[PDB]
Amino acid sequence: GAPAKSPEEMYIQQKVRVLLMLRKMGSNLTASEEEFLRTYAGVVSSQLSQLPQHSIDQAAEDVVMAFSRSE
Amino acid sequence: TRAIPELTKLLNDEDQVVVNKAAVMVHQLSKKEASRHAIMRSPQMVSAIVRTMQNTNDVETARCTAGTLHNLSHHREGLLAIFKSGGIPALVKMLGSPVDSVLFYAITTLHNLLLHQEGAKMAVRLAGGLQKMVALLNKTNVKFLAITTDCLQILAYGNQESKLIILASGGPQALVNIMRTYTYEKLLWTTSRVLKVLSVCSSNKPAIVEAGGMQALGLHLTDPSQRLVQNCLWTLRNLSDAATKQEGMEGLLGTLVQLLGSDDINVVTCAAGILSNLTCNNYKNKMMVCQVGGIEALVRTVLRAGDREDITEPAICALRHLTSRHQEAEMAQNAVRLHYGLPVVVKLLHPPSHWPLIKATVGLIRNLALCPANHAPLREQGAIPRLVQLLVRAHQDTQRGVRMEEIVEGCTGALHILARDVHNRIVIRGLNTIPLFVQLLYSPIENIQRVAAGVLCELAQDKEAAEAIEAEGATAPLTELLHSRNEGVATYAAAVLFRMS
Numbered sequence: 001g002a003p004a005k006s007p008e009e010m011y012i013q014q015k016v017r018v019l020l021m022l023r024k025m026g027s028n029l030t031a032s033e034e035e036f037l038r039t040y041a042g043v044v045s046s047q048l049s050q051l052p053q054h055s056i057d058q059a060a061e062d063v064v065m066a067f068s069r070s071e
Numbered sequence: 072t073r074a075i076p077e078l079t080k081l082l083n084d085e086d087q088v089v090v091n092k093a094a095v096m097v098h099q100l101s102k103k104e105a106s107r108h109a110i111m112r113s114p115q116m117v118s119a120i121v122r123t124m125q126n127t128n129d130v131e132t133a134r135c136t137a138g139t140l141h142n143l144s145h146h147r148e149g150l151l152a153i154f155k156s157g158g159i160p161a162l163v164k165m166l167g168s169p170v171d172s173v174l175f176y177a178i179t180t181l182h183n184l185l186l187h188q189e190g191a192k193m194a195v196r197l198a199g200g201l202q203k204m205v206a207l208l209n210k211t212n213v214k215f216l217a218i219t220t221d222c223l224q225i226l227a228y229g230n231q232e233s234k235l236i237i238l239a240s241g242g243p244q245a246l247v248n249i250m251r252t253y254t255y256e257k258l259l260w261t262t263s264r265v266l267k268v269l270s271v272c273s274s275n276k277p278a279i280v281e282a283g284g285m286q287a288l289g290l291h292l293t294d295p296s297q298r299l300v301q302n303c304l305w306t307l308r309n310l311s312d313a314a315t316k317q318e319g320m321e322g323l324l325g326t327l328v329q330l331l332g333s334d335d336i337n338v339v340t341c342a343a344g345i346l347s348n349l350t351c352n353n354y355k356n357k358m359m360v361c362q363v364g365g366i367e368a369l370v371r372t373v374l375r376a377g378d379r380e381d382i383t384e385p386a387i388c389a390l391r392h393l394t395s396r397h398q399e400a401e402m403a404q405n406a407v408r409l410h411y412g413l414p415v416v417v418k419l420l421h422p423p424s425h426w427p428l429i430k431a432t433v434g435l436i437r438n439l440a441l442c443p444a445n446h447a448p449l450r451e452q453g454a455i456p457r458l459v460q461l462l463v464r465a466h467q468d469t470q471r472g473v474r475m476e477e478i479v480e481g482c483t484g485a486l487h488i489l490a491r492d493v494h495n496r497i498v499i500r501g502l503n504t505i506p507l508f509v510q511l512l513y514s515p516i517e518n519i520q521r522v523a524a525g526v527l528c529e530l531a532q533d534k535e536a537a538e539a540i541e542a543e544g545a546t547a548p549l550t551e552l553l554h555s556r557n558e559g560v561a562t563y564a565a566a567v568l569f570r571m572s
Binding site: 015018021022027030053057058059067071 | 228229267268270271308309311312315344347348350352385388391392395396433434437438441484487488491521525528529532558559562563565566569570
């Protein structure tokens, strides 16, 4: 639902968001957290279909080796 | 034998008819070792032949005078003599001759001069020889082109000026046309050598690439002429870092993968280096090299290479590119294992390996760890304790190589992925690393914070571990990162804080 009318609902709201991002990034959620997401499917939907995004665990991009001075 | 001086006189006559009859005779004497020395010793004579050849309007005399010079250029005295009497500007003008004869003699004499006569190179450039030679590359007489291209290589070697001129005349497109059109070994060789010299010039490099140079040279990598193959490979390596946006590379890539199995260590070294550059940020090439069994070729090439970092470093960097960011990425990661490459990869993290190779080896372990089936094998290969040793030493070096900050990021990053497996987490924790990871959260470097928080986040998925992390004073440094602009740092930092509850 709406943002949050209490510290408590602010927490849940943020926790759901973080758990959704954590998973989008490739990390697994704990059993406790999976249960949490079910308990607030209401909150999960609100910022799921309307407030999506992508992710990335870690990285190690590609470098282009150079080879100069020959002839 | 004082006939030389009478001919010199005749050659300078007014009646072209005799000027001709004289050119025939000089040319004939030009063939005898005795008659020829007399000619190359009278600067009056040689100077007559030149002016004549250059100003005459009778083809027979243009060919005869030209041939005579071609004969004298055979000896030391002959060359100095032609040079001293302004032969070069002359011969250069003759490159414009419409006769396939006067032309062959002119380019051949010039070749002799460029090869031996001191002061020859500058004179030819001076007379605009480079421009005429390049315009001459549209001929189809392979022997002629072989001579011509070789003059260009002589004139371009270590001379930026000449190169740019060759570039302004469309030398790269003509040279590339040759590599795609002819099969005469000597020509392909002399031409590949002109491209090699031109490929070290940052402005020529892009032009050769756009003319289809990568593909053109890729055509001769399996040729029996070993000197032809080597020259194309060298040129290919010099151009590779500027050809990572080209299409129609299927053939070259496949051939390159096959060249990895060669017994010629310089072939393998070059092929590896070229593949490394071409798979760097080009998923198209990554998928292709994978479809043609590149992972196996690369793993086999590393096993055989041993401690030869000239081969393993490019190979490992190529394997790293092929194990991330492309549809076949997950398959390659898995393929590296199936072909017995994990043990060799992990080994490379240890001495005698140097930092560049260790840095590249870390990035690959990191990619290989993305595939859960590599989690245990990498562990059983002793990867974890070694990655922690590199990290710990790079970090202490930093708090007091090739940038130890990078080793710190790569090792922590590799451990972050490896921590996805329960047994790996137990090992990472038994190595007493949590205090270090918590310390890493205070790094000024954003990329270090992300991987530090990430590994702490993976470890925290276990209750006992999450409690030790909290007990290690992680809460303060983590909270200070909750407002990071880096979604990664912010997310992981929040995750640990939530898990410690």
